[PDB]
């Protein structure tokens, strides 16, 4: 999503400066000709010179973008989705889910009919997701450093992610004004929102319709996806990651 930046191609070279050569008790750097102005006789064209040209000027045709293979991107999304169902990972990422009834958090499809932001907040309170939303608002602050003057004035913590499975649902606009709350359609889940900062354990609120579509969208270990042609969920190198059971099993301990 980056926009290119580059210095002007002509910067530092809008000058007819030439070296004085040796024999005049000064360095051989090119110098501005003429007289009657402080600029006359000054160095030019040098990356070490005031008003000169920077070393290796930045160009617009830098390779800004990256194309990761589609299968790897699908692998990353599946891992992020799986991590969202582990309360330890969700807590480890900074989400306040102490009052959440259960993970994964699946709510009735009636939430998709909410039209007012006031009713949207009441829905969050009922399911116990409000404290995480309240955390995001209380973290509203001005960005330290030069970023604040770069049209990036404010920063805040991430709130819950709401996933809905009905196109055109009205909840997309009832929740959007709440700071930290993101809304995404199930058919087009985005990794940048599933693992913000490259950190697993995003707090996700699933609607019933969206939750029931996960098998169709991503398939299973046995049959392939219906919407990702020929895609199967990846397998781990270790069927059982519980070392204690393996190490303390009767077979090993014998």
């Amino acid at each position: 999503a980056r926009q290119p930046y580059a210095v002007s191609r002509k910067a530092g070279h809008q000058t007819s400066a030439e070296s004085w050569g040796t024999g005049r008790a000064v360095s051989r750097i090119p110098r501005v000709p003429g007289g009657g102005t402080h600029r006359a006789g000054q160095g030019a064209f040098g990356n070490m010179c005031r008003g000169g040209r920077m070393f290796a000027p930045t160009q617009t045709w830098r390779r800004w973008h990256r194309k990761i293979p589609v299968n790897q991107k699908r692998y990353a999304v599946a891992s992020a989705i799986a991590a969202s169902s582990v309360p330890s990972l969700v807590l480890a990422r900074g989400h306040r889910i102490e009052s959440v009834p259960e993970l994964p958090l699946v709510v009735s499809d009636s939430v998709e009919g909410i039209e007012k932001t006031s009713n949207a907040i009441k829905a969050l309170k009922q399911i116990g997701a409000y404290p995480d939303a309240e955390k995001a608002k209380d973290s509203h602050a001005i960005r330290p450093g030069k970023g604040k003057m770069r049209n990036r004035r404010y920063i805040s913590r991430k709130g819950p992610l709401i996933v809905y499975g009905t196109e055109g649902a009205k909840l997309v606009k009832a929740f959007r004004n709440i700071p930290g709350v993101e809304i995404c359609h199930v058919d087009r889940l985005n990794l940048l929102k599933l693992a913000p900062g490259g950190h697993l354990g995003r707090f996700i609120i699933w609607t019933k319709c969206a939750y029931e579509k996960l098998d169709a969208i991503y398939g299973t270990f046995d049959k392939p996806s219906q919407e990702k042609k020929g895609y199967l969920l990846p397998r781990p190198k270790m069927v059982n990651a519980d070392l204690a059971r393996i190490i303390n099993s009767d077979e090993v301990q014998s």
């Binding site: 003057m149 049209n151 004035r153 959007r176």
Partner: protein, 132 residues
């Protein structure tokens, strides 16, 4: 979040538009809230300050002072209020400029245009805010 493609969220552009705004535009930018009594009467929240209006200062060291506007110095983004003055080192009296957003309009200088403006402001609120 804004969605109008003709509207910019650039800090640089907003500041330039504010500080280079012509006198007619500065009139709207120099608006003050109506008093709770006038708000319930005309059903209007804000109004551009006028020369002959009466206002009350609600912020600053002159909080609580009440007086009549005597000059809308648009070039300086301030208004002058009768009796709201300080003394120079030489003893002379100079009016203190106050931003119109820091006062409350207690009485309006009504006229043919002012009354018509009040109707338009109330017309939208009476429909877009209540009937909806």
């Amino acid at each position: 979040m804004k969605y109008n493609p003709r509207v910019s969220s650039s800090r640089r552009k907003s500041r330039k538009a504010h500080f280079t705004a012509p006198s007619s535009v500065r009139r709207v930018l120099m608006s003050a809230p109506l008093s709770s009594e006038l708000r319930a009467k005309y059903n209007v929240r804000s109004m551009p300050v006028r020369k002959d209006d009466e206002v009350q200062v609600v912020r600053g060291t002159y909080k609580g002072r009440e007086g009549k506007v005597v000059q809308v110095y648009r070039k300086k983004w301030v208004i002058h209020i009768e009796r709201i003055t300080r003394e120079k080192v030489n003893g002379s009296t100079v009016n203190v400029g106050i931003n119109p957003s820091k006062v409350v309009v207690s009485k309006l200088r009504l006229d043919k245009d002012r009354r018509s403006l009040l109707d338009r402001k109330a017309k939208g609120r009476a429909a877009a805010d209540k009937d909806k």
